[PDB]
Amino acid sequence: SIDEIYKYDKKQQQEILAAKPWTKDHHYFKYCKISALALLKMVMHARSGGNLEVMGLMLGKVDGETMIIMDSFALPVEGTETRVNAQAAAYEYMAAYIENAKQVGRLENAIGWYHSHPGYGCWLSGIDVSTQMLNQQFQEPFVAVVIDPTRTISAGKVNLGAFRTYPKGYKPPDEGPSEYQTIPLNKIEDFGVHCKQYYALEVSYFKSSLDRKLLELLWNKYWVNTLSSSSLLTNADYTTGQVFDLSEKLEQSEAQLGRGSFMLGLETHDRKSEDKLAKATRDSCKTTIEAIHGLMSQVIKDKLFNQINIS
């Protein structure tokens, strides 16, 4: 209801999972309620991976034709497109959460899995639509939510949207893009075909959750690990390895300025990848900002403890 969906109700989850209304019509889910506290945990886990793809797991309940996204945690799996069937790593976390919830009188189970698709916008490719169909028949219900961390920086728009892939025997023959975003000139042909496999849902927001309340009691004793900075020695191989890739980009810029993408008859459309000098500038600054970021964590340590001395 209105005031019952804001809290955890045991009678609401006992009249839905026992009857399973999703087995009659696959288009039962219309809206999706994502907690405001869990949204910050999904945009922070995908931002730490950078250009890579990561996956996680969401927990919550149901209340009719609207899903509830309560708590959510990260997963050590390297996304879903790289590693086929990424739900095998979450079996150890689910076996320890359901057993600890049935003893206290709680029927909260799995609600969906979230990932990240940086680069080609927030959509479902041909790999995510195949693995989701095999998980909805065993661990129901599920929902795929895509978060773009590298798109809310330049454009400034918080990309968020939940989708659900239709199973075999219910896909529409013709359906336009429900949630259309930006796609680079490379995989735009697959957007007009794979859009009929899933559909967008009107996302909502509410305040509840429970995971955002026990992290303060842990910080009272785990604060000695949060100060473990010094990023200059952690990913030292990634900083030096990025300079090798910069030399290959700088060599391509020399041939771009020599030949020139402005010829007679057909200009500004000669070379494949134009503006090589402008793109190589951001790549050179990436190795500089990441190098001075690790030093700032060391200078700040030599100004608070090393400047004390002794009499």
Partner: protein
């Protein structure tokens, strides 16, 4: 760990030095404050709330 020197016949043992020892002393120093904070609040819980209000008053 360690290496063996065949010139003078003196075997040395590795006990960590240089940069890896700098982060170990910082984590060990901050760990002593965490254990000391649990002892102050256990022996005298009234002094923990009084010391926190002194920073907000200044």
């Amino acid at each position: 760990n360690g290496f063996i020197d065949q010139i003078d016949g003196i075997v040395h043992f590795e006990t960590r030095e240089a940069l890896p020892t700098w982060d170990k002393q910082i984590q060990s120093l901050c760990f002593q404050v965490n254990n000391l904070l649990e002892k102050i609040s256990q022996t005298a819980p009234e002094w923990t709330a009084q010391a926190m209000e002194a920073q907000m008053a200044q």
